[model samples]
Target chain A: EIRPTIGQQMETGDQRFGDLVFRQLAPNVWQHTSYLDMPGFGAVASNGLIVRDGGRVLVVDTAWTDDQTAQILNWIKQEINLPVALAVVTHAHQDKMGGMDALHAAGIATYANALSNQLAPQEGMVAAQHSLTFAANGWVEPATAPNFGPLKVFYPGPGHTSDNITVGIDGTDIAFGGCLIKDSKAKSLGNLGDADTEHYAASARAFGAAFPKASMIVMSHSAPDSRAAITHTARMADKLR
Target chain B: EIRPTIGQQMETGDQRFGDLVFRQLAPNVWQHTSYLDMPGFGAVASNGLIVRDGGRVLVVDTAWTDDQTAQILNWIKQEINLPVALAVVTHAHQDKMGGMDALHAAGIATYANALSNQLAPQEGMVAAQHSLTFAANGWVEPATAPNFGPLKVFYPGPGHTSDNITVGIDGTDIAFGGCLIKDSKAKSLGNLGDADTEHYAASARAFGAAFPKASMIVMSHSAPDSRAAITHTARMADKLR
Candidate 1:
């Protein structure tokens, strides 16, 4: 299960920010982790997912900074020999959107939830060029969803932020939860200064319920986990309560 | 339940920001609302809680900007005949920490979570003068909590950001959740560009479980709600999912 698909070799390399390790998680799905130094938090890792369909690649989230993201994009262009068509930022935090400007400069179409667009400028961060405003209910299938081929973006609720979203790849049912879902090893909820603690557990539960078919779940800072990771998070939430 | 306490008059006034209203929720706990205009969002309001203990006052969160916050602080000094001793920013967003520089310059000590302290600078925000970093377990009672004279600050989890916190008044059990808890009228989760949605519901549940006795809950940008509001939010999370 950990091995890359035939003809798709696992890639590992270094950038100015940190080391990056990429492995194919499914037929057309790849998961990558970037190791970087956070100012006060020391060395930490961020994760992103790549979905390739019809010779087009869609990146979910980005590396630590613009430079690192640019490097990853270059690698995709050179090695995959496919066009990096689009990028979807799952949230407004730096790790998710910090590299967005790079994507924009490279002429790659970038999209995020409307909430992310509003908050990024307020936080002095760059906003994505395009936005996907979900319906009042928090889920919308935009016309552009098909542009990424099998990619589906959903706003399950606000656990991490009002704007945090999840990306699911059709057929494979592989989903990226960004910072919303914790890895199985997480003992306690991590940084929650901007959290909606009152409803975080419910948000996770909702995400799990909505994408019950998702077999593999990828989180922002940890290794991939099974659907049981969501259950583990629920238990942790109960204990915190 | 919506009515102000007896013998305590509800105060309504006007400021440059917009309309201003204050109502007494308990013996020494007063909730105030400031209406202001956000650039893209049009007219919006932010709420703060003022707790008077002895002859000093503690303000949780602030008005929309520094100008409005200064006016409120001035009213506290001139009209209330009390010195504003301290302020607490529940998160790193502008609504909570925008007026912090003014607070610092006025000799008012401001406190926030250490995570907020770190992310604010990175977000190009004005970091608080003092920070309270919680233990790995997520709840830390700092010595400075006593300086506010019965105020308790706790990091429930990351909903809005990794640093959002809640403040509780010891005897009254009145708590201010900043933006972590949505207003009662909110149909969908509010701005969450900086959120960590996966853990938000759990964080909210944790807060409620930890402070089951909290009778009055003050959200950052909405009217105060009773404990029932937490239940309302839990249901809302379920629907959004």
Candidate 2:
């Protein structure tokens, strides 16, 4: 039983799905990378996170298609031997919520911000069923607080999209910042098809303030890292301003 | 003469350019609006600003095409009777820098951040004819600062593009935030095809902080606003974060 460290990449060779690479960032948290030929932007990559909590599981974001989403779900069930309790969507973009139909078909509930719910249809995409209109209660100590669960979802504000949200895992202190937070190497905001660039910086600052303890940050399209994501986003916001 | 207020709409009847609107924001700052049919996104509107400084003039941003850019220059010369001294490009996008060739032909010097300079060619867009790579000397009370000039250009960071820069007018205490800052009515960060979403918020915050005395803010594509632009943008950054 060997556990992987940060920045390590593992490949899963599925004949039907081609090659899927999973990068291990922390204990029980893995990043799944998938490639797709996006219109206007040529070939691009997207990332999602899988969190294993005891016999239950939580997934942040989805692959580019329902088939890819199904592959992940099947892999989790067979390999991890855990039942996926829920899947949280960060925004309305195809890379983030493209697999909602498969998630629903598999009997897994999906969650998203109310704004995301509204924009998905307008953007010609399916909306997640569960809408997180309110902020999750602040996490306290003791591990069994009122809102104490394996995961917590929050809507900091609008930058990447009006409906984008972030997810916090209990033990790892890791936040899935979705597309709102970019990788350290990213030179520009990847896709602005639905971004609120004007209010983007304020939104990112609010998210960073809310999750002061989140040392490990995960983004939708890049490698996961520490507070560098927040710092890098903030620096870029100021430069852009 | 009737002057327009913030958020008011006016129409300029140009058959090719569709409906162009102009809004009067301050004593010398005016907002110009134009409509375009963008591919994939359908019909969309963009904004620019004209600042009259006595017999000399400064234009922030450009319309969607070289023809529209020419119209603005001609109008400034014929209507305002001012010699256009400079034009500042906020980013490398067509809306901001599309008129570079026209500006050069008219002998108007254009300036942008170094990063915008680096990205413009890669994006297959025209770069600003001039570059503002260094920060101007700090403004002192006596008006004799070493590097102080009528117009101060600064590169806060990368939001809309790596090369985006903001311009400050000495007498007006007005800062043009380019495309990095959104209009008061903007619901999302429009046209992030070349944005750095991660660094966007931080860049905006830096720009806001840099200009504490700026009472009026002009975005490349919105009505001229008071501090509301900064406040609105900061709030959105927090939400998106």
Candidate 3:
């Protein structure tokens, strides 16, 4: 089932989907998983976050393609039936910003770090519509993240990529670690073609420190997770250099 | 302030309250606590739940008084400002039904067990406008609970009050265990006058069994807590038998 009942979601994470699947991980927070078939990797699932706050909704990290992103937007419109007020891309990478064009076309303001926007075009994915210059380690106040919802976008120095960022919904333990934080199931820090390897472990440590309350940490390449994933990612990153 | 910012709520549950306070525990779930100084119990905090889904909100349990209930309604009107589509009085107790009049006055349809509405009038409180005769040991489907939101009302026989009920928001691990589930700080089963002591342990077991996925459980007399409280409550209830 593309849209499973909440019982199904809570009882089991194995909900069926035709490319894009939306499973709620926490109250008002959903995980949208889209599969990406890499030339060498075969099949990998990329995850994005859909956060609903009051009447408005926010999407973090677009899917692997515009069509998938469009399907996500369609599901949000027809199925979830909430207006998309805010969208965010975690980094300059293709998996994160691949649907930026579709998001921009939808006429919703999207946000990312200034570094992400600059690096996006170099990698062929379009830059997010808006950019927030972040200070680092804490939370980007609503004034810069456009402040309407509870999203607390944080930058933990350099990790998966120099531009990769993490966001924890303010009132929730739910955090989006993007590709910077790896899955506990993962064997290694993935796709380090653009990784900040030397400082990656420190970045992961900072991410963990910022959200000790993070019981639900959404990831890009695997199932949604917890604070322990930060420790897992840090330990794995130690071997990078 | 009746409605504190999500950051403040995440940082501290001690947000100032004149008489009523709302603090977010999960994505779409907020704990509403109101203070009532009883002749015997001193200043007891009676907690309720405010669950937001899409554009609508659901409030579980009334406060200690109609004025406090009226204050809660006003906060929903001017502060949280979401249309309250559903209300449930957990039981016939004064802390749960003291505001039944204010809720009905707001023209919002209220829900409770048939026994609750029946016993409500016996205690000089107004009956809930609606009743759901639930089947035992499972979720109340949307048809009876209404399909608009993600609320999953469950019947686990009787514990705190013969009419007491529990509600878990669908799609999330957040559940309102009401007075049936005690806080970890609670040393006793409490007020056995209305409690079905012989079956209280069984009822608590059933409640815990129904929501093993429940990570955040909201309580009536104390702060919101984890599923361990269910076991804590059950262990304490065992002494009654």
Candidate 4:
């Protein structure tokens, strides 16, 4: 008998949480989903993706929710045997890092905005635990990954968070935006909890300019259909001006 | 006859929608409790207050939910008879301006960061209705307000939200912070939806320096009982360096 799958349970609003959705936007590039549900607030899953180049694998934005994260991990294990060298959290949201525990369990090195590292470990612990405890699941925090890869992960000056970092995959022309700049469809630059809209706009625009060599933008939420999608969000920053 | 207070039901976990807590921080300064929920989401309510200086009254933040906004108006009608001369939304959070409609009914004028006007209006029909329906609220979107007697409201670059502005009360020597600085007790910076932590830090420090004479800092979240709370958050930017 097939044991009930976490995905199936999460679909039924069961004990399992997080919904994983994947779409191949380009050759060897696959995007993943981290479904979010805040009752009475709104429901929309954040997005993360895995891009494989040659023999290496880079995953962006650990789908933070436990159940959804487990599903992403399960997918990674099933689809690619290469261990995740670097896991990038596009921004610092619990939904983005909820799966850090599971990714850490798999020995994947996680990187985020440095400010996120300092801040996440403190305030995020409670929110992360709430999800795990609410679902009666174990919560884990990933130890800093010492052996990630060759990419120069720039400690981009603060845009989304005090410590939001951008990961540039060596030869891969893609950047996994962990809630930094979702497709333009993203509503209202998110909740603006600790945001500086003008600076965030500047940071996003800078990302666009600095990464001009990048042919595609892999986002943490919403689907990235084309380079235009990246430009759409970058242009949205113009609204901030 | 006294209706069952909303608080009476909250004890049973069946919080009726309309229960509100009202407190006066100063003679004309009042902080209406917005239930103090959602510590992480920056766009949620901190505390909405009304500062009455002679015949002029300034409403800070509008509260998060509609129920909370209604309660604020009820108190205004029951206590203060003057229409709101100005409504200052410290940033672009719904909790800050969610009650624009209620305030509009009183023919109040609204003031916010220039960027917020561009960004906030697009939150969709509900938001549009909230703002336009309260059209009579007579919103005034200004780039900056230079003088308020001894107090001065300055843009101070940007923090929290791109549209964030600090209201400096001269005699009290307090600047009302909307979520411009992190609560010292908060575990993490919370959500980074559309913020620039680096800028937030810088701007906070700049404001602190700009107001060298400031002795008290009043935040929308909690009352300032000590001078440290003001300097601590305001100087957070300097600490980052």
Candidate 5:
């Protein structure tokens, strides 16, 4: 099936390329949903947020594979016509930083918390080039790239993974909660292979406190919803612990 | 049955006063567990922390009724021989502040969150004479009384009730968790009729953040465990919300 171009919105107002789907969240922000067909799980989709300002775009996460990330890069270059200036991997999970190699290959600089870098290889995901320095309580401003302004990163303790961090846009009330938060439809915390059940709720509470006014939060494997979704995620983690 | 007076520990090292029991957490810090004979729920117990400094003692909760509070005062005067100088009602619930009248009658001053004072009468409990003013984040120092020197009070948002607060002893690692926290034995959240389920775990996280070094958290209904109990409480709340 031929996919709709970036400027063109289909009947669903979503632009799709193969297994990747993009939905506009704001004038400069878009949500990209990519899937991984795994055994027993059918098709598991992951979300990444794309934010643009000036002539450059900041990617919150890479898709499930480098091919997917390359497709996204091509779409930005051809459709939106903006350079992929910088990127941030929210955690060490495959869905969060799976296509880190693709971004690095394109010469686009990527940033992540020091902890994520340490844990990424263990999870079979590549780490970002830069190790982020936290100001206090794991909060990082858009320090490395001023062009990626308005993007804020905070590592609120531990949740799904010990290195999970949340990305927020300063101009909008939307936070890319990534894997640290689960959507409302979640029955149980997806995977606890490398998790801290005790502090999962704590990390989520920290996320809510950091982005108190965030109306929308993008979950990696689940659809984006209100900040209340993560609250649900937190409460779920509380119950499990 | 005749009860053991204060300063006299039974075989269990727990001092009993009829239905009221006191366990010393520190030299001057005692945890009082009093019960309410609810119809179907069997005997429901509550916890209140007593911290003594110099010749005065501060009560963290008032027990289930004025009679219980009066018995506690009698125990303080006759056995401990210390004046019940000040008290703090951790919340509006009858279990936490039910002995308000008894404290007032004994000439002991009491304080609580302003929100708790407003909610007390609705739950059939009297308000304290003082309304607490928070410096920041609902945290209040032992401002009104100097005699309760080592006692610390922090209201980290809403959990069990909108006004539920936790009292801690600076001299010890024990905190009067009241209704805001659940002991390890609690099967459920107890009562959610007046609860903020979404923020229950958040408040507990705030509690954890504030008192990071706390060893034991005294649950009103169950026996006191380490700080891990409240983490369990927080995780449990996360599940429900």
Candidate 6:
């Protein structure tokens, strides 16, 4: 008799697609490859995702550096054979939107909150350059970045930064909530110098309620597959409120 | 014929009474006999006032200690010849409600903001005794002390302290605003430990607007009749805002 454990099966899949596996989370909906690695910035690295619906691919947030974005985009180019149609910025932080210029130069329509638009020019570029240098020791020049477009972009309000935004995908019952919703058991809510705690919770609830059927909630820097993840986010919100 | 200057009149009033001579600001309104004078313990002798209407006299606020209250009440007895019907505590600290026990012991009813009530009983009496003992050598006790009447007191909101309340006189447009509003040029808004600039201004505006035609505006300390007084208060409020 031969028995194969779930871990073994996942290992096989992991081996097949180094960092570009398209795993089905729900019917037709998929989550792209990502790894959990603690970066030097004290925050864990869990970025990268490709959400597909029908024929359109909606990439929630981007990588931390132009180089990392290039790697991910190269993977997508080779695996999916198509450019990401819609790129939504969960917030204006460099870690979440650094790859935007690269994708935008490739003709992807980038969208984010108005607040992010204001902050992107002021601090976003500098932050991206810093993170990129820290990660690989050289700055990758950004390709032409796209302009912001209209979405219900709610200013659920300042927390993290004045330009922080949480991206919501209405039709798919999915949300690409950024750093606003940390891992439930997170020891601290990190820094709230810019983000208002009250607004952060409200924004999370808005996304949670709006995406009740969401099978795969993507966080800008963590895994969000289990109900425990959602509960943890809710608990964090409660503590703040 | 030679006219007496205001300062000379005040000095004459002070000399005649040996404690500052009480001045009637309006029909039934009265003010302190002294300015901010620190004999010892570095306390400014900026005393308070009391107003009489019908059978009741509402004491604006108690001064620094039992000695201060005794002096003011002594003068009231000598000049007005009426018992204090009530005591209104504008804020906390020895300068505001330090003489409650003395006045209460004298058979006068005492009133303050609901929060101020928390400072009464042991804490208020202890503070009063401590200040009185600290200034025993140079402190001159007042003869006419503040008294209270049965009043339906309301603590509108927190300004100076969690327990600060304004005194309202029924059938008359007189409001004992206390130290919430200071003269614009005042070096500091009394003290910041119990100060909230925004809330102070709002409370001042609220009190002023509530009784727009107020014939008298009583303060805990400082010259209430001086035109520059309110400007000083507004200055503090504006700077804070």
Root-mean-square deviation of candidate 3: 23.1
lDDT per residue (tens digit) for residues A1-241 in model 1: 1111001112343223235667668878777666555232134567898888887898999887888788888778876779888888888887788788789889998888878988988766788888787765556557635475777778888776777898778888787888888766453344454666667787788778767899899887666788877887666555433
Q: Each candidate's lDDT (Cα)?
A: 0.70, 0.66, 0.74, 0.53, 0.74, 0.49
For residue A172, model 5's alpha carbon misses the true position, in angstroms, by 0.9
Candidate 5 runs further than 4 Å off: A1-11, A141-147, B1-241
Instruction: Report how far residue B47 has shifted in candidate 5, in Å.
Output: 41
Q: List runs of model 3 lying over 4 Å from the truth.
A: A1-241, B1-13, B39-41
Which ranges in model 2 have alpha carbons more than 4 Å from their true place? A1-19, A39-42, A136-148, B1-241
Instruction: Return the lDDT, model 4, position B144.
Output: 43
Interface Cα RMSD, each model = 21.6, 16.6, 22.8, 17.3, 24.3, 32.5
The lDDT-based order of candidates, best leading, equals: 3, 5, 1, 2, 4, 6
Is model 1 an incorrect, acceptable, medium or high docking prediction?
incorrect
**DockQ (Cα-based) per candidate?**
0.02, 0.02, 0.01, 0.04, 0.01, 0.01
How would you encode candidate 3's per-residue C-alpha lDDT over B1-241 as one tens digit per residue?
A: 2211000121255444567777877777777778654321124567888878888888999988999988888877776778999797778888888898899888989988888889988888899888877875555544656653776778787887788888887788888888788765353554555778788888888887887788887877656677778887887677666
Q: Quote the true-contact fraction of every model.
A: 0.00, 0.00, 0.00, 0.08, 0.00, 0.00
TM-score, structure 4 vs. true = 0.45
The segments of candidate 4 whose C-alpha lies over 4 angstroms from its true place after superposition are A1-18, A125-152, A170-172, A185-187, A225-241, B1-39, B42-241
Docking class of 6: incorrect
Off by over 4 Å in 6: A1-241, B1-18, B33-43, B120-156, B168-174, B226-235
Task: For model 4, report DockQ.
Answer: 0.04
**DockQ value for model 3:** 0.01
Q: Tens-digit lDDT track for model 4 on A1-241?
A: 1111011111222122224556665577777765565533434456666777668677776765766776877777777776666676655567667677776666665665445655676756312111100011111122343444434344434555655655555566776555566554332344445555566766676566656666767655444535665566566555655
The TM-score values for the models, in the order shown, are: 0.47, 0.48, 0.47, 0.45, 0.48, 0.39
Residue range A44-163, candidate 5, lDDT tens digits: 567888888777888898998999988888878887889888998888877778898999999999988888899888778898998776656658745643555778888888787788
Write one digit per residue (lDDT tens) for candidate 3, span A63-167: 889989988888788656888998988898767888887888899888988888898778787987788777644566556776546787788888778888888
Over B64-177, each residue of candidate 6 has an lDDT whose tens digit, in order, gives 666767777777787678767656556556667666667866776654433345465634433222111111221112222223332223343445555555555555555556
